[PDB]
DNA sequence: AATAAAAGGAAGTGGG
DNA sequence: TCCCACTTCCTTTTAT
């Protein structure tokens, strides 16, 4: 299937769910979730993966944190803010 | 305070 | 079989 970072990047590069997620600095890959609207986006991720349960922002961030080990997505020390690697922003 | 976020271990799921 | 890439579940810590 489709990887979570890819799903997120595709929404950012096509501008859907701007009420739920947006660039903080596009050229640096840094993006941010909305406090109020992030659950619509979590829900959409879970629908698209066919998961048994309703996907939530907390479970999605749990996955997001695993990218910290590999490097695709780094947590920034700002509320609800993350950062794609340069490698991810190419392909 | 209070509370939303961040954290992360551990066993579970799909599908290749 | 095994491994990947999450997903689920829960308590504890940290940041606002």
From Swiss-Prot:
DNA binds at residues 49, 62, 65, 75. Induction: Highly expressed in both FV-P and FV-A-induced erythro-leukemia cell lines that have undergone rearrangements of the SPI1 gene due to the insertion of SFFV. Negatively regulated by microRNA-155 (miR-155). It comes from the Eukaryota. It is found in: Nucleus. Residues 2-85 bind DNA. In the bone marrow, concentrated in hematopoietic stem cell, lymphoid progenitor, myeloid lineage (granulocyte macrophage progenitors, classical dendritic cells, monocytes) and B-cell clusters. Among B-cells, predominantly expressed in pre-B1 cells. Expressed in germinal center B-cells. Belongs to the ETS family. Pioneer transcription factor, which controls hematopoietic cell fate by decompacting stem cell heterochromatin and allowing other transcription factors to enter otherwise inaccessible genomic sites. Once in open chromatin, can directly control gene expression by binding genetic regulatory elements and can also more broadly influence transcription by recruiting transcription factors, such as interferon regulatory factors (IRFs), to otherwise inaccessible genomic regions. Transcriptionally activates genes important for myeloid and lymphoid lineages, such as CSF1R. Binds DNA as a monomer. Can form homomers. Directly interacts with CEBPD/NF-IL6-beta; this interaction does not affect DNA-binding properties of each partner. Interacts with NONO/p54(nrb). Interacts with RUNX1/AML1. Interacts with GFI1; the interaction represses SPI1 transcriptional activity, hence blocks SPI1-induced macrophage differentiation of myeloid progenitor cells. Interacts with CEBPE. Interacts with IRF4/Pip and IRF8. Interacts with JUN. Interacts with RB1. Interacts with TBP. It is linked to Agammaglobulinemia 10, autosomal dominant: A form of agammaglobulinemia, a primary immunodeficiency characterized by profoundly low or absent serum antibodies and low or absent circulating B-cells due to an early block of B-cell development. Affected individuals develop severe infections in the first years of life. This is Transcription factor PU.1. The lineage of its organism: Eukaryota, Metazoa, Chordata, Craniata, Vertebrata. The chain holds residues 169 to 259 of 270 of the full protein.
């Amino acid at each position: 299937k489709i990887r979570l970072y890819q799903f997120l990047l595709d929404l950012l590069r096509s501008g859907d769910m701007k009420d739920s997620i947006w660039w903080v600095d596009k050229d640096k890959g840094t993006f941010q979730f909305s406090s109020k609207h992030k659950e619509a986006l979590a829900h959409r991720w879970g629908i698209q993966k066919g998961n048994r349960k309703k996907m939530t922002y907390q479970k999605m961030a749990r996955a997001l944190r695993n990218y910290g080990k590999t490097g695709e997505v780094k947590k920034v020390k700002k509320k609800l803010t993350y950062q794609f690697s340069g490698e991810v922003l190419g392909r």
